[PDB]
Amino acid sequence: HMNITDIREQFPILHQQVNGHDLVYLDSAATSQKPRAVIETLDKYYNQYNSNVHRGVHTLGTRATDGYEGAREKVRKFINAKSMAEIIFTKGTTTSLNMVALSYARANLKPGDEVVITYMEHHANIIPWQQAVKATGATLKYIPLQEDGTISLEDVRETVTSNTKIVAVSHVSNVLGTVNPIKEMAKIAHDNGAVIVVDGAQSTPHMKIDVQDLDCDFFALSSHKMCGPTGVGVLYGKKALLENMEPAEFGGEMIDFVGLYESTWKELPWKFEAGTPIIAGAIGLGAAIDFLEEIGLDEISRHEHKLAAYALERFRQLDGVTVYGPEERAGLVTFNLDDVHPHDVATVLDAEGIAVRAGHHCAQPLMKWLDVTATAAASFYLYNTEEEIDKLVEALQKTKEYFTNVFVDLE
Amino acid sequence: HMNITDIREQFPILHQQVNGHDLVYLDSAATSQKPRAVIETLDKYYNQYNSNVHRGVHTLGTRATDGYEGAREKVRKFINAKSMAEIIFTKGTTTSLNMVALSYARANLKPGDEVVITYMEHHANIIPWQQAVKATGATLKYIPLQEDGTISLEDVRETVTSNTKIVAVSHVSNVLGTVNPIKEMAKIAHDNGAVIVVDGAQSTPHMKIDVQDLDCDFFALSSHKMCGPTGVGVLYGKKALLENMEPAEFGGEMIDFVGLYESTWKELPWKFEAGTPIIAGAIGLGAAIDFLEEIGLDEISRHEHKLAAYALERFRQLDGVTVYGPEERAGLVTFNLDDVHPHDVATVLDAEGIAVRAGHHCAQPLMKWLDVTATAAASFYLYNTEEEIDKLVEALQKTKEYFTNVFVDLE
């Protein structure tokens, strides 16, 4: 039901050559590309109705307000939050998670309290917790991984104890592609009297999110990964928790009364939005959501499942290539070529027009767990095709041959 | 030397009607409009070279990096910072000031330390200090104002003492239009062993900034007020201070090594940029800077001086209108009509196509100092004209007559 030609026709950026070869963008896990609907939403904003929001005193101001808060509602429906009061716009997943670490963790952790993460976590979902525990004298714990880089519910029950206040975990790992059992972990967390914090940066673009079904306490996501503008993300949190959290930042827009020494805050969600907000970016994110909903997240999810399966099979056709993670996975493949460093791989691939990523992918502890220094990584999205994966595996074959040849040439 | 027709031809948003009247946008102090150069910079980014930055492994990634860091350098030259290491991209002035309050104030304030602000400060430049002093048991002090809403160097010498660690003040007030004597206040602050924090949200769009000449320790500004995209601003800080400040946020991009419990940070400026940054917005801000530099800040400044003088004179031609602030001023006029509430004024003006602001303008303490509940406010920028000010004063005359008539009609 999903036509890939029709979808690709909407991404101007795809139709270009690099190094005399057709662009083959396989770096969506770093950042996604944007369709016209999104870019033109930005355009129409700046061309026709930019103004500050929340004053409703003049025509453009009212239009801007309607667009901004309208986008809040689009986000709310998109992740099935109960209320707009639980939808905060932030700069991105990183900032969202830091807000939870700052306003929730730092205020609710005493020595002997535990916060539990996992070895596969992006840095966004590591360092805020390191800092909160250091600030509070609490202690940081890591759920171990199984051999295929998935997580066992048994290990979860093992690690989270009656002293655990916070469990923070990825919905989908940008590295292993594992989909973690978020719903079961929420139940487990709650049984021990903890909240669960979900890093949803890699799930949100690619699959339906239902915060009511996941029963997550907090869920963070980033516009740039889902066809949206850069610079914008969301923090969702249960109304009851956000009511008792103090703001992470202070200034205009988030106050009610300001005296000389003391101030009171707006109601949610504005309590958490200091300063002129990300007006254009939030409206474009709303457009991104409209776009993805019109294709259907289930459809996108099916597409990525299909591409991931095809990729794993074609990679298994190559000698001297190791793929990391489980079989059951999101649309990305992290890998190494035997004897060639991933930076080199990525460089050569760019010479064929192929965009991939090489490095620690913001997961240094996970790299160490994998017993590697660095990895190459390819990621797929709703505009990618099997032909592109063919080009990738052919280029990896050619790269293997080339490096072997260089080796033998040395006399 | 500056042609206003030619400049207005570049702002699509201006050429439209509201309520059957030509738009007359006089709300630039809330947010400024954008020229094609900026909007098309965004367009070209998303159309041609969007990718994550700082990896330089594939063509688009390198272009994106060059555009982002290129824009950092444009900012650096634009405010004459010595180094890019002193230029941090943030979400906006609010966030910039909160970063200083979080990472500098909160870490360097002991009971009996003073932080000194003024009565005219925007909320962005009040509440972070309230919170830092409450967190540290330090004490908050306010420099008094003179009768015309300016600041006396004598009052400054009075208020800042040998116990003062931080002096935080507006360069230009969004309400009074006063230009504060920043350079002299820096000298004064430093004599008592304090740093000075400059809120440059209202100066930056409108006049040359020279941080070396101002000798400010920190200076905050916002893209949206200067023809730039929403969602982006800058914090400048002296390299020596930023080296000793801990990050305000933590995650990928701002680390060097991440172990299980402990992490080390990147060098400046990246130490302060957690997460995928505001890629498109920062590049558009660079474009905004290019635009303003091609017109010339001195030229823009002259234009606003001219419009402000013309406005004050025409306002003084109206009976029953009170204008707030000094004669020597930036391009904005805050005012009330005798007996009509400013909200009403602004509503009626919108019915004539005229966009102004009515409320506390994020300066509740200053409103109380003025002995008013709220104000109406009009602001000018590089696209505004004398004809527009004529339309405004005519509409204020008509409004006065209308409300008086309504009064007499009641029998």
DSSP B189-245: HHHTT-EEEEE-TTTTTTS---HHHHT-SEEEEEGGGGTPPTT-EEEEE-HHHHHHS
The data reach a resolution, in angstroms, of: 2.7
Which residues of chain B does A276 touch, with a Cβ-Cβ cutoff of 8 Å? Answer: 31, 92, 94, 222, 224, 230
Per-residue exposure over A10-30, b if at least 16 CB sit within 10 Å of its own CB, e if not: bbbbbeeebeeeebbbbbbbb
CA B170, CA B274: separation in Å to the nearest integer? Answer: 27
DSSP-assigned beta bridge partners for residue B397: none
Peptide bond into A269 cis (omega under 30): yes
Buried b (16+ CB within 10 A) or exposed e, B44-58: bbbbebbbbbbbebb
The C-alpha angle with vertex A378 and arms to A377 and A380, in degrees rounded to 5, equals 145
Is residue A195 within 8 Å of A114, Cβ to Cβ?
A: no
Q: Are A233 and A221 in contact (CB under 8 A)?
A: yes
CB-CB neighbors (< 8 A) of B91 in chain A? 91, 231, 275, 278
Percent helix / strand / coil, chain A, rounded to 5: 45, 20, 35
Q: Which residues lie closer than 8 Å to B172 by C-beta, 6 or more apart?
A: B178, B179, B180, B200, B202, B203, B206, B207, B330
- Alpha helices, H only, A256-385: 279-295, 297-316, 342-351, 364-369
Query: Cis bond leading into B269, ω under 30°?
Result: yes
Q: Is B373 helix (H, G, I), strand (E, B) or coil?
A: coil
Tell me the C-alpha distance between A335 and A376, whole Å. 5
With both helix axes pointing from N to C terminus, report the angle between A297-316 and A386-409 in degrees, rounded to the nearest 10. Answer: 30
Structure tokens at B135: 């967190």
Which pair of tokens denotes residue B106?
């909160």
Query: What count of residues does chain B have?
Result: 411
* Biggest distance spanned by C-alpha atoms of chain B: 80
Cβ-based contacts of A287 with chain B (< 8 Å) = none
Chain centre distance of CA B344: 26
Residue A71 parent element (H or E): helix A59-79
Identify the closest residue of chain B to A51 by CA–CA distance: B31
Distance CA B113, CA A83 (A): 43
Cα–chain-centroid distance for residue A367? 19
Distance in Å from the first CA to the final CA of chain A: 57
| Range B38-294: architecture per CATH | 3-Layer(aba) Sandwich (3.40)
User: Active site residue: A18, A84, A362, A372, which one?
Assistant: A362
* Beta strands in A73-226, from DSSP E residues, in sequence order: 87-90, 114-118, 139-143, 164-170, 195-199, 218-222
Instruction: Retrieve residue B248's tokens.
Output: 């305000």
Structure tokens of B346? 């602004």
How big is the A-B interface in CB pairs under 8 Å? 294
Q: Which residues contact B350 (CB under 8 A, 6 or more apart)?
A: A57, A58, A59, B18, B19
- What's the rounded Cα separation, in Å, for the pair B211 and A355? 40
Selecting from B13, B25, B275 the residue whose C-beta is nearest the C-beta of A95 gives B275
Q: Report CB contact under 8 Å: B355, A60.
A: yes
To 10 degrees, the CA torsion angle through B58, B61, B62, B66?
A: 180
SS3 at position A90: strand
DSSP secondary structure letter of residue A178: -
Q: How far apart, in Å, are the Cα atoms of B20 and each of A33, B24, B354, B356?
A: 39, 12, 11, 17
Strand partners, A141: A116
Return the number of other C-beta atoms located less than 10 Å from residue B238's C-beta: 18
The two structure tokens encoding residue A304:
């990525």
Do residue A252 and residue B48 have CB atoms under 8 angstroms apart? no
Considering only CB atoms, B31 lies closest to which of A52, A122, A355, namely A52
Residue B143 in contact with residue B117, Cβ under 8 Å?
yes
Distance (Å) of CA B111 to CA A132, B134, B135 = 24, 10, 10
> Are A236 and A85 contacting, i.e. CB atoms less than 8 angstroms apart?
no
Cβ(B231)–Cβ(B92) below 8 Å = yes
Q: Which residue of B has its CA nearest to A253?
A: B362
In angstroms, the separation between the Cα of residue B44 and the nearest Cα of chain A is: 9
Q: Which of B48, B136, B230, B379 to mutate to test the interface with A (most CBs of A within 10 A)?
A: B230
Q: Would residue B362 show up in a list of annotated catalytic residues for this protein? A: yes
Nearest-CA distance B384 → chain A (Å): 16
Q: How far apart are CA A158 and CA A192, in angstroms?
A: 11
The CA distance from B97 to A250, in Å, is: 9
Interface test with B, best of A133, A141, A276, A279 (most B CBs within 10 A): A276
Question: How many beta carbons lie within 10 A of that of residue B299, not counting itself?
Answer: 14
Strand blocks (E) in B112-161? 114-118, 139-143
- Residue A199, CB-side half-sphere exposure with 13 Å CA sphere: 28
CA–CA separation, A260 and B130 (whole Å): 8
d(CA B72, CA A211): 38
Token reading at B84: 């890019």
Which residue among the candidates B30, B127, B362, B374 is catalytic per the annotation? B362
Neighbours of A397 (CB within 10 A): 15
- Beta pairing class for B263-265 and B139-143: unpaired
CA distances from A54 to A84, A275, B34 (A): 15, 12, 20
Shortest CA distance from B10: residue in chain A: A47
> Judging by beta carbons within 10 Å of its beta carbon (0-12, 13-18, 19+), is residue B404 exposed, middle or buried?
middle
Instruction: Write out the two tokens for A251.
Output: 């200034």
- The β-bridge relationship of strands B354-355 and B164-170 is unpaired
- Residue B173 region by backbone torsions, left for phi larger than 0, else alpha for psi between -120 and 50, else beta: beta
Choose among A234, A281, A289: nearest CA to A42: A281
| Residue among A23, A218, A257, A251 nearest A108 (CA) | A218
- CB-based contact A333:A314 (threshold 8 Å): no
Nearest CA in chain A to B258: A364
Q: Could A140 and B260 be called an inter-chain contact, meaning their C-beta atoms sit closer than 8 Å?
A: yes
With H, G, I as helix, E, B as strand and everything else as coil, classify residue B372. coil
The nearest CA of chain A is from the CA of B411 a distance in Å of 30
* 3-class secondary structure, B354: strand
Angle (deg, nearest 10), helices B36-44 and B279-295: 150
Q: Is A231 helix (H, G, I), strand (E, B) or coil?
A: coil
Characterize A204-215 residue by residue with b for buried, 16 or more Cβ atoms within 10 angstroms of its Cβ, and e for exposed: bbbbbbebeebb
Tell me which residue of B160, B165, B156, B94 sits closest to B125, measured CA to CA.
B94
Of A217, A262, A207, give the one whose Cα is nearest residue A78: A207
HSE, side-chain direction, 13 A CA sphere, residue A54: 18
E strands, A119-276, where? 139-143, 164-170, 195-199, 218-222, 233-237, 255-258, 263-265
Determine the 3-state secondary structure of A222 from DSSP: strand
Q: In angstroms, rounded to a whole number, what is the distance separating the alpha carbons of residues A225 and A228?
A: 7
On whether the CB atoms of residues A309 and A389 are closer than 8 A, the answer is no
Rounded to whole angstroms, the Cα distance separating A183 from A191 reads 13
Which of A25, A46, A173, A375 is the mutation pick for testing B, counting most B CBs within 10 A? A46
And the tokens for A129? 């917790």
Token couple for B294:
């091609």
CB contact under 8 A, A230 and B124: no
Give the C-alpha separation, A408 to A405, whole Å: 5
Experimental technique used to determine this entry? X-ray
B179: CB partners within 8 A, 6+ apart: B171, B172, B203, B328, B329, B330
**∠ CA A280-A281-A286, rounded to 5°:** 100
Tokens of B15: 């050429």
- Give strand pairing partners of B199: B170, B220
Which residues does chain B have within 8 Å of residue A251's beta carbon, measured at their own beta carbons? Answer: 94, 97-98, 122-128, 362
Taken as a whole, chain A contains a residue count of 411
Residues B150/B178, Cβ–Cβ less than 8 Å: yes
Residue A232, both tokens:
């914008």
